[PDB]
Amino acid sequence: QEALVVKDLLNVLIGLEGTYIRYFNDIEFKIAKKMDPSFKTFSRRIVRYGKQYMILTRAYEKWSDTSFGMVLQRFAYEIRRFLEDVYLKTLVERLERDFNKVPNFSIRELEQIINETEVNKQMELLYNIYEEIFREIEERRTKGGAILKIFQQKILENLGDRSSVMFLKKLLNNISQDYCTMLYEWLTQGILNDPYQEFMTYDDWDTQYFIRKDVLLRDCDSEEDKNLLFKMLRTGILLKVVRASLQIPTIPSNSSDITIQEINDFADLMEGSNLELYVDKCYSRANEIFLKLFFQG
Amino acid sequence: DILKYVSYTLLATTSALFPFDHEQIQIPSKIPNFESGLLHLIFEAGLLYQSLGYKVEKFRMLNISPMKKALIIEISEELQNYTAFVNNLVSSGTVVSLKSLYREIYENIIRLRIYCRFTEHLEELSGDTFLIELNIFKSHGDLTIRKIATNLFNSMISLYYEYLMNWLTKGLLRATYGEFF
Amino acid sequence: DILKYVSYTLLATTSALFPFDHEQIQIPSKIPNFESGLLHLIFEAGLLYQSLGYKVEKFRMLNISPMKKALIIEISEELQNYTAFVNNLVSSGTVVSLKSLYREIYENIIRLRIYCRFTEHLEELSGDTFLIELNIFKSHGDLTIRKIATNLFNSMISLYYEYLMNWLTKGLLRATYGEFFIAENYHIPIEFNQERVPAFIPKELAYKIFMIGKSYIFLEKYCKEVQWTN
């Protein structure tokens, strides 16, 4: 009775998507429960583990093979990859050992290590992806810029809890890059990019540019935020008019600031002083080339 | 025996002993639940490969756009890697776990899926239209998708550059299947 | 069977077959006297673990002091060891004596108890107050208590050092939940909190820091200065 029940329980854990251990789309996976005090306690621990595994896979599908945000795609591919890797490696190995020795050996040791590894990473990751989705539903009814605001707000919000925040930071620095590429292109060489969202700047002889307020601002109001945006619009306009002027002296011939911007993304702050440093360099480069176009040509 | 069938399906050879509907196993209870689940996951991956392999083979019959030919060539070379992988797994994993089998060939799933969108769009239009299809796909995020799109691109663009050189230097280069404007 | 329930209770899962009041078994005569006594001792230890485990889980809901988060993290990691121990005992002590069971997991009892005082004091106050709570506890004797207090400390202090660096170098770091000695009250000032600092930073030392910091904010208001050698 007792040895058999403990065994059934071990076998089941390597594949919960089985042919007798059934799946409900929303409970989760369920298997008929049996008696012994030991087994019913153990099935409860198992349930929690199982629920998160199934949900991480649902979430991942939505975000993959289709576009709603460039950022969203990158976040899903990475999240899944790490989580799966950990879970399969520990579990497959742990089960094999138990089986080799005598396949009735303690479930408890396998449970404590997987619970520890998961808990910190998993909760935060899964909640966040949903929050971003609700917010996009709301924005659409009312995009790019809105996603950046929400994720900066979330790193501030969570504060402490070291495992989770460092993990989230590693993901964040990879996600920042499209925004970084757009800022360097716009501010330094005058090209605004936007395939369906990549920021929140839109166009409209020399033309004008402005911020889509609907898509939401970079840090959505603050005096520092406002000056910085005005400065970004101005540097970009100078460059574009000069690019238009053909093969008459264009492109700053002073050094790049991609390297300065990239160190700001790795920081994962929104601080005024770093951001201000980026615009004044871009501004200068843009001012000098602007001058040169005019004077010489 | 269980590993062997699963391998056949990964090779793009249909196995008699797993039913084929269009995406999964429909195998009754009569076999271990645990293995059936694992088996569910394998078939999704194996189905994706077979379906892509059929598309590439069919579109291969020559006397098309070279721009199409250049995609079929790149695709075919990328599929090769898969076949080498199945071989490593059988050789030094004779009795090997299906859950484990699934994890090892993870990367290849990510790659196939994106390609299957592409082959579908190849049906609609012919020629220079692919470059546009290619441009929208690069716009979507993820390190992989862009990379895969750029590799198709280097091949197609080499062809444009040639067509342009014929056009500008010695006059009239007609599109035919769409190689030019 | 007897060992198994006892294990559940040590896991922080409540057993149907021992009554829960708040500290002990109330199990009638109907079972061996000898085993009941042994069973009395086990429950005290097991009760302590469950109660601590509930506290740590509840206080975990984020958006608090990091100084609290850093304690919850240390606590959670220390509880892990307990769970591994229960597992050694079941594995290579299938039919094992309860008196013996009690002796083997002795150290863990000494550790839990002290922590339970701490979690209670965490309820009252928030933030930098913990360092004071922490300072009085270190003052009491015994090699363990001081050690346990120092480990919580290394984690909290790392956080202060950071808050201080933001404050001194780039001006205004507000406490929020109590991370610093800034108190409220364009034209709105701040002021000094003498009360929050433990004895390890004197109140005079803290004030000097407040004074310097105040001057850096005044230099940026004059007209914003670029991040220098400081």
Gyration radius (Cα) of chain B, Å = 20
Out of A108, A116, A161, whose CB is closest to C86? A108
Looking at the DSSP bridge assignments, the partners of residue A209 are A203
Q: In degrees rounded to 5, what are phi and psi of residue C184? A: -80, 145
B148 lies within 8 A of chain A by CB = no
Separation CA C105–CA C87 (nearest Å): 12
CB contact at 8 A, A18 and B27: no
CB contact at 8 A, A264 and A148: no
Q: Which residues contact C213 (CB under 8 A, 6 or more apart)?
A: C167, C168, C171
Alpha helices (H) along A219-271 = 223-244, 258-267
Separation CA A169–CA A80 (nearest Å): 16
Q: Which residues contact B177 (CB under 8 A, 6 or more apart)?
A: B64, B65, B126, B127
A16 lies within 8 A of chain B by CB = yes
Neighboring chain C residues of A112 at a CB cutoff of 8 Å:
80, 83-84, 87
A112 lies within 8 A of chain C by CB = yes
H or E segment and range at residue C192: strand C190-192
Separation CA A207–CA A190 (nearest Å): 12
A71 lies within 8 A of chain B by CB = yes
In three-state form (DSSP H/G/I as H, E/B as E, the rest C), the secondary structure along chain B is: CHHHHHHHHHCCCCCCCCCCCCCCCCCCCCCCHHHHHHHHHHHHHHHHHHHHHHHHHHHCCCCCCHHHHHHHHHHHHHHHHHHHHHHHHHHCCCCCCHHHHHHHCHHHHHHHHHHHHHHHHHHHCCCCHHHHHHHHHHHCCCHHHHHHHHHHHHHHHHHHHHHHHHHHHHCCCCCCCCCCC
The per-residue b/e assignment along B152-176, b for 16 or more CB within 10 angstroms, e otherwise, is bbebbeebeeebeeeeeeeeebeee
> Where does A158-224 show beta strands of DSSP type E?
201-203, 209-211
B142 lies within 8 A of chain A by CB = yes
Total residue length of chain B: 181
A159 lies within 8 A of chain C by CB = yes
CB contact under 8 Å between A112 and C84, yes or no, is: yes
Å between B71 CA and nearest CA of chain A: 20
B near C: at least 3 beta-carbon pairs less than 8 Å apart: no
A252 lies within 8 A of chain B by CB = no
CB contact at 8 A, B135 and B77: no
CB pairs under 8 A between A and B: 80
Structure tokens at A80: 């899944």
Structure tokens at C77: 């990691």
Determine whether B94 is exposed, middle or buried from the number of CB atoms within 10 Å of its CB (0-12, 13-18, 19+). exposed
CB contact at 8 A, B56 and B75: yes
CB contact at 8 A, A217 and A145: yes
CA angle B2, B8, B10 (to 5 degrees): 105
Q: Distances from the Cα of A118 to the Cαs of A61, A280, C21, in angstroms?
A: 20, 44, 33
| Optimal mutation site among B33, B105, B134, interface A, most CBs of chain A within 10 A | B33
User: Other CB atoms closer than 10 Å to residue C226's CB: what's the count?
Assistant: 8
Separation CA A274–CA A224 (nearest Å): 12
Å between A292 CA and nearest CA of chain B: 34
CB contact under 8 Å between A158 and C16, yes or no, is: no
Angle between helices B106-124 and B143-170 (to 10 degrees): 40
Resolution (A): 8.0
C159 lies within 8 A of chain A by CB = yes
H or E segment and range at residue C161: helix C143-170
Neighbours of chain C (3+ CB pairs under 8 A): A
A266 lies within 8 A of chain B by CB = no
Neighboring chain A residues of C16 at a CB cutoff of 8 Å:
37
A69 lies within 8 A of chain B by CB = yes
For residue C216, how many C-alpha atoms fall within 13 Å in the half-sphere facing its CB?
19
Separation CA A37–CA B101 (nearest Å): 35
Separation CA C34–CA C56 (nearest Å): 35
Separation CA B136–CA A195 (nearest Å): 8
Solved using: cryo-EM
CB contact under 8 Å between A161 and C69, yes or no, is: yes
Q: A33's torsion region: left (phi>0), alpha (psi -120 to 50) or beta?
A: beta
B99 lies within 8 A of chain A by CB = yes
CB contact under 8 Å between C63 and A109, yes or no, is: no
C172 lies within 8 A of chain A by CB = no
Q: Which residue of B has its CA nearest to A179?
A: B141
Task: Determine the distance from the C-alpha atom of residue C169 to the mean position of all C-alpha atoms in its chain, rounded to a whole number.
Answer: 30
Structure tokens at A62: 């939505």
Separation CA A179–CA A148 (nearest Å): 9
Where chain C is broken, by preceding residue (C–N > 2.5 Å)? 185
Q: Distances from the Cα of C4 to the Cαs of A5, A75, C47, in angstroms?
A: 15, 44, 16
CB contact under 8 Å between A65 and B33, yes or no, is: no
Q: Which residue of A has its CA nearest to B38?
A: A15
B145 lies within 8 A of chain A by CB = yes
CB contact under 8 Å between C63 and A41, yes or no, is: no
Q: C173's torsion region: left (phi>0), alpha (psi -120 to 50) or beta?
A: beta
A50 lies within 8 A of chain B by CB = no
CA angle C20, C57, C117 (to 5 degrees): 70
Out of A17, A65, A81, whose CB is closest to B113? A65
Q: First vs last Cα of chain B: how many Å apart?
A: 56
Pairing outcome for strands A201-203 and A29-30: unpaired
Å between A2 CA and nearest CA of chain B: 20
Neighboring chain A residues of C226 at a CB cutoff of 8 Å:
273
Separation CA B147–CA A45 (nearest Å): 42
Pairing outcome for strands A201-203 and A209-211: antiparallel
CB contact at 8 A, A167 and A122: no
Q: Distances from the Cα of B30 to the Cαs of A19, A110, A265, B72, B113, in angstroms?
A: 9, 29, 55, 42, 32
Neighbours of chain A (3+ CB pairs under 8 A): B, C
Neighboring chain A residues of C228 at a CB cutoff of 8 Å:
none
CB contact under 8 Å between A21 and B110, yes or no, is: no
Determine the residue type at A90.
T
For residue C182, how many C-alpha atoms fall within 13 Å in the half-sphere facing its CB?
22
- Tokens 């770091």 belong to residue: C173
Å between A236 CA and nearest CA of chain C: 24
Neighboring chain A residues of B136 at a CB cutoff of 8 Å:
195
Structure tokens at C46: 């097991």
Q: In degrees rounded to 5, what are phi and psi of residue C225? A: -100, 145
Q: Which residue of B has its CA nearest to A9?
A: B34
Neighboring chain A residues of B45 at a CB cutoff of 8 Å:
none
Separation CA B61–CA C19 (nearest Å): 79
Please name which of A53, A42, A37, A44 lies closest in space to residue A8, comparing C-alpha atoms.
Answer: A42
Structure tokens at C4: 């198994």
Separation CA B2–CA C229 (nearest Å): 68
- Tokens 């093979």 belong to residue: A65
